[PDB]
Amino acid sequence: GKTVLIMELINNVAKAHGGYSVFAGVGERTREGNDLYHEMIESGVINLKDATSKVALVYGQMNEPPGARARVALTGLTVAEYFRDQEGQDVLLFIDNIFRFTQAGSEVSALLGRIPSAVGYQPTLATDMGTMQERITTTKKGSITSVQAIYVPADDLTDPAPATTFAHLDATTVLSRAIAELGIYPAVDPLDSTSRIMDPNIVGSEHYDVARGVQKILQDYKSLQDIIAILGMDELSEERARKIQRFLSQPFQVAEVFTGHMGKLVPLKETIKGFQQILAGDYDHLPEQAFYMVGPIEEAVAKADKLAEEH
Amino acid sequence: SAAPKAGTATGQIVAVIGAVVDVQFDEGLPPILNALEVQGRESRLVLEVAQHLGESTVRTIAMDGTEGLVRGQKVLDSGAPIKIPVGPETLGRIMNVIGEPIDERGPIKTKQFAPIHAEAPEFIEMSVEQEILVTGIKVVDLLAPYAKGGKIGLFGGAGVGKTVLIMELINNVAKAHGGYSVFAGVGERTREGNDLYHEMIESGVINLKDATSKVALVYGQMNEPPGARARVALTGLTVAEYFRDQEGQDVLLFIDNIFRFTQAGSEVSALLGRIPSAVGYQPTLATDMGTMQERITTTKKGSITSVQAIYVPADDLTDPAPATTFAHLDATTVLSRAIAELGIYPAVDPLDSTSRIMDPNIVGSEHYDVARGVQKILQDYKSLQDIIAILGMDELSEERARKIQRFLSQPFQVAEVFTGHMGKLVPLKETIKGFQQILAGDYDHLPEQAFYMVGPIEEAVAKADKLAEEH
Amino acid sequence: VGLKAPGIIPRISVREPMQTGIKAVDSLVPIGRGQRELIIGDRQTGKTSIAIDTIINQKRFNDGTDEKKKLYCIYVAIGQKRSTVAQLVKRLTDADAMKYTIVVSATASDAAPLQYLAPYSGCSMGEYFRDNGKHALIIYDDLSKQAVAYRQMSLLLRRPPGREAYPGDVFYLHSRLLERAAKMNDSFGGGSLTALPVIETQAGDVSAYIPTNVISITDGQIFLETELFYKGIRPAINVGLSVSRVGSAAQTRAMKQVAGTMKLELAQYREVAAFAQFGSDLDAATQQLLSRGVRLTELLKQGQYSPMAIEEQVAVIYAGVRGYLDKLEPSKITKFESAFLSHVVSQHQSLLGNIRSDGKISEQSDAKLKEIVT
Amino acid sequence: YFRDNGKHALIIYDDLSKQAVAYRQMSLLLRRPPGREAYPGDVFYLHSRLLERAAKMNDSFGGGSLTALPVIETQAGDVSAYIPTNVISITDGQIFLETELFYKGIRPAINVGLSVSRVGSAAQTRAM
Amino acid sequence: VGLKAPGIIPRISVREPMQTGIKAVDSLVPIGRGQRELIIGDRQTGKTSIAIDTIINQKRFNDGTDEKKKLYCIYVAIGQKRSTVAQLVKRLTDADAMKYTIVVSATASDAAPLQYLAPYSGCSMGEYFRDNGKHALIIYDDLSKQAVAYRQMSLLLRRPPGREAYPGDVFYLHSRLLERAAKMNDSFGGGSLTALPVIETQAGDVSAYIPTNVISITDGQIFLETELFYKGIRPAINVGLSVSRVGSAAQTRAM
Amino acid sequence: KDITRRLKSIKNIQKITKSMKMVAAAKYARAERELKPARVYGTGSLCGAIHSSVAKQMKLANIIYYSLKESTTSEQSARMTAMDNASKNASDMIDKLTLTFNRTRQAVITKELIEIISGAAALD
Ligand SMILES: Nc1ncnc2c1ncn2[C@@H]1O[C@H](COP(=O)(O)OP(=O)(O)OP(=O)(O)O)[C@@H](O)[C@H]1O
Ligand SMILES: Nc1ncnc2c1ncn2[C@@H]1O[C@H](COP(=O)(O)OP(=O)(O)OP(=O)(O)O)[C@@H](O)[C@H]1O
Ligand SMILES: Nc1ncnc2c1ncn2[C@@H]1O[C@H](COP(=O)(O)OP(=O)(O)O)[C@@H](O)[C@H]1O
Ligand SMILES: Nc1ncnc2c1ncn2[C@@H]1O[C@H](COP(=O)(O)OP(=O)(O)O)[C@@H](O)[C@H]1O
């Protein structure tokens, strides 16, 4: 759920965005680049007629050598740069996997006359990921609100690839594979999804508290789910979560091609009342999965009808 | 004697790369292990020769910084290994990896100096006599007994109670010890070396006035290069040697981490022209740990009751570092990190703490039996604690341990700086009656942790009062 | 920057502690001056904030009376985005904190050698003070990232790698450095330099090569666990895997009076607080040693862009160690620690004054406090 | 030939995995520094380069096609091994076959949650 | 010491067992003569004592009647502290046991090649008997430590390492050796040489590279578990992970 | 990283189970003090699996209290066992999965270490 999400952020954000946008596709499928092209035509974003185009598409993918996947990310960045600086505007940049900027070195390093390292990699990955990501930023001349993507080789966050990267991203979202089984989508995890913009001053005292409280209940939840009770719940200690887990499983737009579920979204609007209830106890009792593949509390009772239980 | 050939014993440095300086002599190649003097210096820089590269060029290991060294600097050939002054005239002073005085009290006037590289004692020098020596500690003295000339080994996984223990063994043993003592601090903190210094002043052990000093302090630590941490252990051993041999006395030697003798190689190996091994290490670690530890022993001339310490990199006993070492230590004590959570201190574990002096002949039939019985109950205990019952105890099968685990958790002296708990000790004295009871069942029932941070059974009821439960 | 650490004789004894201002920190884990306190901790966990509070705490000191009771600050940034750095420079500037601080940056762009030479550059900064009577606080933000950044440089010189590429002298890398922040004896200057090396915890492992390499040196390591944090348990310090090492010498008589029970009450409590969740029929009243983790825990959770001076820290926590608030179901405790002060700086302006007179807890104010608490 | 002549085709690469076992061989002998599990680093460009060649052809280009199903060897159940990641990280749609099931009667034995069609419902006609 | 083991034709069948004297051993795990019995086991577990009992058992034999019903002993010490060795020499001397034994030492100090060449030196010791009708018992105390000690020597000759530095021919290291303690057919001499290679168990793993390398050869492996011992369960032998292999041929009709 | 995950569950099971273990005997204390005078001659003349064998055999303060009083202990005994026969046989796994970490702790350390040198040591 890394690239699906990005098309999505394009949906809510890219289109409605004022100012120009870019999309560097580094490494990943040509299939997607194509569709992404034509979808950007179907929805005007890219218009082949007038001159009402806002996105710029830079590509260099899979069917190419590493010297190419090494720099396509750079180029699609050299683009977004020119717009922010010499043309003072707040750009957006979409890199479909930015660490391909490193598969690259991992494919050229040793064959360059270098001594390997972590996993074989390169004695440069740090400066590499560094020197590059330190361009996609704001300044006294303009801003670049960017969106990247970073792959997890062998499913190991322990890879110095997803790892080293972290120190750059102004919000984390480690989608879990053991989560896709659970269907939870996006697979964003209630632990490893940080942010350097989550203080009560900007997000909310109310909001950032129940967030602490959501992951709190979640932590001892991660333990209880197995520890003490041993899988089977019930046990004792009635001292919500399974509820909230379904809350943040918004199936949204870009996931329509699976089960008709559509654009589950809406900008904060009615999160209030809703999610808070779960945690303090209020409104919390609806027969478990009865509130699964949807989000708003208003659909607890607007579904209870769908699946009723009584006599 | 230290005197070269009728041809230049001076070479000129041809290569510098951190801790390895290659030198090139024309008229008098210096053997491996020879101490070399770097000229043009503002201090004392000795480079220990290590290989004979050919092209009439040697290969040295730097004993201190290689800063500012220059490709052409003259290097002098002493004609003998690094030799430190040995003698009673080194007691109460602090030496470094070359014998230089670092406690600042001026020159170390001595009759002679001994090479830090000496042939280990031969087979027909060894001694089978294993006379016991008491420490009055729970697991450490009782479980895995110690002995005269016997080597102690404390396996700690980085901050689990390896060095605290040693200061402690100094407490009960060092002070009351008749005969001289040594302390080689290899690798570890300078902070400790300092305190250890001043504590040894506060308690007279080291007296700066008379000449009533018994310990000798050799140091070479962390803020230094590996060529130095490689040999400080040797020097502080070359010391203890001279006392045992040429001065027939039963010495004690305290090495704060003796495998730093190997971090050393692990920092000089590959950069010497060698092919790596286990973890990267060195194709020499075996002979290394070997050749060295086979000096700190007894003989037909005197005894060296030593106490070492061995670190556990990445908490893995599976490291060929704590591992390889084992075969040398005459009593084991693998302090566990999963034990410090439990607070159990020392963190000595009821499994991996062996001894080659735990037979009924020397420890006790009564003692070595309940020891077997303590670890016995403990083994199926390690299983039961999780296996069958699944964490929560109670279950069924009433068929003590949790008690005994608190018994051998003597918080003692060197741990006062934490919670006022003091010198919990006493030499075997009243272990009798006490620990045996637990196991057979007698006196065993006192409300669990009610007997936790203390040892003697006499404090089960002398605490029951502290925390009472009835009506 | 290639200086060799002092030694046995120049140094003396870590005394005259340094105030982080972080209750949980100082009280529980007190930091003495001239020492190295390791703050390990995973991504998003507080390492930079705590150090940033610890540094913000010298405020009132850098313009008041007792010169010796001061502290200059050296903040080393290694790897970080040069925006995160501007986040601090500006933010520290808000509290005027920058006015007595020196900050150095080796931010990503900078070639590997810089991210390497950087700490050894900050060490020297403070050494000016540690060698001129004056004291200092240096923070090596991410030595870990410097580890990622050292191997680079060596491998390219073709210096055979060893463990995880780490050039073997990965020790002498971080021994050599920390060993330079020492305590200075009167006879040498009385100066000091305290260093808190920041480290990146990989999912919770504190014993990784480099961490071992670093914890195996430093005296005192504050572990910050991402595992907790959100729980509210912030700073989130794990006892049993984190120590002060230097012992009670750091904690003044004040904390030696109150805090004396705090950290090891929780050293074995990590069992009972890891049991109670299923008791029922045991030692009925064993619940006290338990009632004493929860309620206090909510007093043990300092958290804000503001430090509560030593005498305020002697105010709120003490009240707990001396179980008076106790019994009452936690929840609102947060308002005590908050209001007890707005209530203290509004009427109780003398009680704090008995720590700048006696410098410990008075027989008197014990009662006084005990009256506003009850 | 077909994907470029209007005509369509189905190619099956039985064991690219075994080709992985078989690629490193060749490179190591040319002394091209190994990386992960000997795999010559360009173990990606090995299997990217290839799969990326079975594509869909637009009318304006031919209308032809080539569909490819790369076979892979699962080591006890791991689908995320280096090479598999390398391959699943490319391909659009992965049918996982588990030995763990099979005999159960559960054959083909497909694990949902760790296998997808990716291309979406476009493949499945209105019927499905 | 570079001799090649005999072969199919010189050998015959492990018969005429050898008495350890250790009940649990012999009875349960009987050792026949001319064979290789592997005694694996972690630190502090009894490997040297058992072998030392097994050797002490030939006492009454080395001075009585039936010459063929005897046994000479070759004790190889590889790595060990030369004090631990003096512990045995003196101790074996107490039971007079040393009077019919040969002991060889490659104790730590000794450079790696010695700790290497040592076993191949003891093999030859006994081969004197196994080639002169007479029989013998050789104990290779710690081949494991010889493993630690072999890689050293090869790496320094720049012979590419393989697994855990182990020079690839880590097999031919310990195959070559054990394969030399064989059974001798009448038609060749009737002599014998029995070998018990000592091995260091890392926490309980018997299948580590070197152990596999060694258990994959030897016929019959007595596993000694530190996990038990103190339990009183000494020798502490794990059945299911230890065998006699040679079958009931060793155990006489009695057992 | 990995075994940490399945080592968590065990530790998570401990707290709840291992503490209740103490309760397992406590329930007994809160019973006998009054039950005894009513027993013997005072009148006449997971969760284990004890609370089951009696119920499957179907194929006024007298008996109903006397039985329950003695049945009380037969019922909580489940805890006894749940915290002692469920934990006796569930720990080993702590000492087992912890003992292979260091197996694959060491492993990885001595696995990737190979690769690093697999290229480094051989060049020109
Ligand atoms: N007392 C506090 N209570 C709750 N949150 C805090 C507190 N102080 C700071 N924070 C927030 O906590 C986080 C503190 O840690 P921070 O991210 O700065 O450092 P770190 O995790 O140690 O390293 P890195 O910057 O690489 O993530 C910041 O995201 C900040 O906004
Ligand atoms: N039958 C016996 N019962 C209980 N203990 C014994 C018995 N025989 C010997 N011991 C003791 O058991 C230990 C036997 O094993 P020993 O330590 O000699 O060899 P090992 O563990 O195989 O290898 P290492 O010498 O390296 O430890 C000795 O410490 C010894 O004192
Ligand atoms: N929002 C979503 N809802 C449900 N399933 C999803 C969603 N996003 C992705 N998936 C599932 O996961 C698979 C992989 O996701 P994808 O977003 O294409 O990741 P990436 O392209 O980054 O590998 C899809 O084929 C689909 O089955
Ligand atoms: N006897 C003891 N009692 C209680 N805690 C101890 C004891 N010895 C050590 N510790 C704890 O463990 C930490 C590390 O121990 P230490 O002995 O300094 O080991 P080392 O110096 O060998 O790493 C100390 O900071 C302290 O918290």
Ligand code: VO4
């Ligand atoms: O703290 V010790 O790293 O010296 O084991």
Ligand code: VO4
């Ligand atoms: O599917 V992604 O291999 O590009 O993470």
Ligand code: VO4
């Ligand atoms: O090593 V076997 O040949 O016994 O599989």
Ligand SMILES: [Mg+2]
């Ligand atoms: Mg993708």
Ligand SMILES: [Mg+2]
């Ligand atoms: Mg230490």
Ligand SMILES: [Mg+2]
């Ligand atoms: Mg930071």
Ligand SMILES: [Mg+2]
């Ligand atoms: Mg032995």
